[PDB]
Amino acid sequence: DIALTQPASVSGSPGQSITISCTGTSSDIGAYTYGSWYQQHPGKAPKLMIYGVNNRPSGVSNRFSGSKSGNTASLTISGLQAEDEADYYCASFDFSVSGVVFGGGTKLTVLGQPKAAPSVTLFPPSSEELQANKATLVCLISDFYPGAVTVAWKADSSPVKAGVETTTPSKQSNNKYAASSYLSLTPEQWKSHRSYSCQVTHEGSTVEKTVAPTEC
Amino acid sequence: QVQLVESGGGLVQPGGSLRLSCAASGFTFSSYAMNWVRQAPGKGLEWVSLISGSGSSTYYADSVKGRFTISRDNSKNTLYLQMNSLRAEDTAVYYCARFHTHGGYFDIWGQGTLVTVSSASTKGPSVFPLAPSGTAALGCLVKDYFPEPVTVSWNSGALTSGVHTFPAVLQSSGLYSLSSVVTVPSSSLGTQTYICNVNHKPSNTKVDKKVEPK
Amino acid sequence: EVQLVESGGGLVRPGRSLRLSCTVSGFSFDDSAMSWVRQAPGKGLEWISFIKSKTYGGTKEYAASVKGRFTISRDDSKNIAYLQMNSLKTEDTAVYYCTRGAPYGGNSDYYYGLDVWGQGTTVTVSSASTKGPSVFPLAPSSKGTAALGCLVKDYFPEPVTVSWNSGALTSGVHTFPAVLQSSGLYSLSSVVTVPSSSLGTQTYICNVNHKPSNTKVDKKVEPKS
Amino acid sequence: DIQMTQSPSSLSASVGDRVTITCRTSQDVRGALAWYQQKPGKAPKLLIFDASSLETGVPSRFSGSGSGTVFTLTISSLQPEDFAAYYCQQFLDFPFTFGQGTRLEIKRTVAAPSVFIFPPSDEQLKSGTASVVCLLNNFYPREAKVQWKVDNALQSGNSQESVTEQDSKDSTYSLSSTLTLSKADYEKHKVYACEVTHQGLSSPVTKSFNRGE
């Protein structure tokens, strides 16, 4: 038998080395284990970081080093950059049972980022959608960090909660977080209030984008 | 360059087959072992299958041991994984991987193909233009898409900058929603070519919508 | 436990044939791959040949330097390995090591190294017969620390034993490495450092023992008049 | 075929230094290198079996690293039992060639050599071959140039050199230069000189003997 364990999440800084430990467990482990470390950017194919204990693949930066201490293996990243935002996985290959087992993965989060206010875009119900009899009010939040921004929909200057859907923050390629909010309204409801607004709370701040039923 | 491509995927009613094929070029396909790696949406990676270079050495994982069958064709230079009795839990991205000669590590990974199982039927995207109401943002909203993914190409694919692709939205009703925004010059709004194309592979719906200033 | 002992070797003549045997104990012969490695005297390590297990095609292969003149075979049920050399060249004098190749996992065709090494056996190719060492004295004529020396010329095969004061003087005794002269024999130098006052006090006695020819040469080093 | 280059050929270190040896392969081997250790007279043993992994019979002070072309062996705290010859071997494809070989030797205070000239023996005078012996005692480092001068003219192509291993007491090396001349060649000379060039010597040390003194 063989099983792996990885830390929940590790955090460093944009100029410092950090270590992530894959801990292996087995019973009477006289078996031959080959260890590899893989990098995964959000929504992209995993890439081979380390094989063996300290072998780096060609075309991979020399900032990634590996070590084996007893059973536990370790990835050390020095010269940490914002480009190393990813998840890291450890894979153990057992030659006898000839099986490779992965771990839970670690989220390598850096702290060297600035707090940027979100950009909020509000879209009036579409003309085709308006003919469709269901109004979908679109609110897009772009370029925010750290990524936890709540959305409040206001109709007629009062809070509204029915039909509001918020997508979880997603890491944009440009080193920013973005999210979408959709408000579903009846076609008669859309021509009911004077003006509806989106109030976004990114970090303390509140950004208000207004759109009225007078789109015309 | 050495390339691994995955084909075969989409929506499968629980119990279907969905034979996946990964085609590989650039390396001698005969001498290298090939693995399949499955990633559930939002969870970690895990291993499914391994085929040796000569064949007849097939190793599956524990979760699937009488359901997935794996065949490499060196003559056609590809490798196929076949599922049977696919439970609702096995919805994931499937990655094709190569084992190096001195085995243990996945040298090259395929792009990935999406396998989703759900009793819901394929619903073609409904495309609506969110028209632009120095640079202004306008775009398209796709409602009622199931399952992912939908390609939203602005300007017939020519447009490449100023286009933000919003992440997919998991609606409560069971369908999806997606949005694509494009930042075009305020003075260029009256002359730009603003036509969007939505390709929904799961239902094979290729729609060309036109968004105009309002 | 895991033991490899090589047998054979000795002196042979150029152009003839010779056959080295390797005996193993502890690990199974059938699924363990084997290799033959050669060390020239004083030069680096050189890889000669590789035999794979019976279950991985049983192919035999060699380095390009010895291909066409070397054959490596393995015998099952005896747990031994044969290496055969035909048309030996003068250069091929060396220590031969028998090694076991380690497959990447428990089993596989691909190997990462050679784990267990036998003590190695020596193979010398030459033309000269057993010629007992000729001992010549190098007397200290300097003038402090003075050097008294014995030069052993035309010895074969190596090695010879040099003793100072019948084994008494083990301090300051330097035995130079054996040098292969172009004449085919061997040359060795023994040097001893003695005080200038001690140069004319005691008697420098050098004992040269040559086992191959059974030569016991007693050289009395004295200052040269 | 894979060509293997070993750098540097000679390593000088004391106990406690961190020593790095680099094996460079023209082809991209990618994790099929093995580092072997050989004590001067005994059989070698396998130190690093992957480009980075350790065998069981190996102390933890040996570390490996590697990427394609370049593989490195690192010793952090040099215990005295590691002074030996280190070789690399590739394993991607046959032949499994061996590297040139790197040597580790004690670093001590630079000590100049003592040069002694032993003239031809009377016994060997009638033997037929006259030997001139040049002895270099207590030298450091290893590099040393020994030149033979006959009648004030330099000679070459008739010299043999023997180098002893590192001394286990003084940490020095001794060099033996043998010049072999025929009876006619021995008679035809007037003065025989050995010229020693080394870092320790201020100037080339000339030990001369009159051929007939």
Residue numbers in the entry:
A (entry chain L): 1 to 216
B (entry chain H): 1 to 133, 140 to 220
C (entry chain M): 1 to 143, 148 to 229
D (entry chain N): 1 to 213
Reported in the publication:
RB1, a monoclonal antibody (mAb) that binds to site IV of the RSV fusion (RSV F) protein, is a potent and broadly neutralizing against RSV A and B viruses. One potential approach involves using anti-idiotypic antibodies (anti-IDs) to mimic specific antigenic sites and enhance preexisting immunity in an epitope-specific manner. Methods: In this study, we isolated two anti-IDs, 1A6 and 1D4, targeting RB1 CDR regions, demonstrating that 1A6 competes fully with RSV F in binding to RB1. We determined high-resolution cryo-electron microscopy (cryo-EM) structures of RB1 Fab binding to 1A6 and 1D4 Fabs, elucidating the differences in the binding mode of these antibodies to RB1.
To further understand the atomic interaction between RB1 and the anti-IDs, we performed Cryo-EM studies on the complexes. These studies confirmed that 1A6 and RB1 interaction involves both heavy and light chains, as observed by the scrambled CDR interaction. All significant interactions between 1A6 and RB1 are through hydrogen bonding, except for one hydrophobic interaction. Moreover, the interacting residues were found both in the CDR and framework regions (FR). The 1A6 Y32 (LCDR1) hydroxyl group of the side chain hydrogen bonds with the carboxyl group of the side chain of RB1 D50 (LCDR2). In the interaction between 1A6 HC and RB1 LC, the 1A6 H98 (HCDR3) imidazole side chain interaction with the RB1 F91 (LCDR3) backbone carbonyl group is also stabilized by a hydrogen bond. In the interaction between 1A6 HC and RB1 HC, 1A6 T97 (HCDR3) shows hydrophobic interaction with the beta carbon of the aliphatic side chain with the aromatic ring of RB1 Y100D (HCDR3), via a CH-π interaction. In the interaction between RB1 and 1A6 or RSV F, the residues F91 on LCDR3 and D50 on LCDR2 of RB1 were found to interact with RSV F and 1A6. Specifically, D50 on RB1 forms a salt bridge with the K427 side chain amine and a hydrogen bond with the amine group of the amide side chain of N426 of RSV F. This interaction was mimicked by 1A6 by forming a hydrogen bond with Y32 (LCDR1) of 1A6 to D50 (LCDR2) on RB1. Additionally, upon superimposition of the RSV F-RB1 crystal structure on the 1A6-RB1 cryo-EM structure, we found that the buried surface area between the monomer of RSV F site IV and RB1 is 1149 Å2, whereas that of the 1A6-RB1 complex is 1405 Å2. Since 1A6 is found to bind RB1 at the same site as RSV F site IV, 1A6 spans the entire footprint of the RB1 epitope on RSV F.
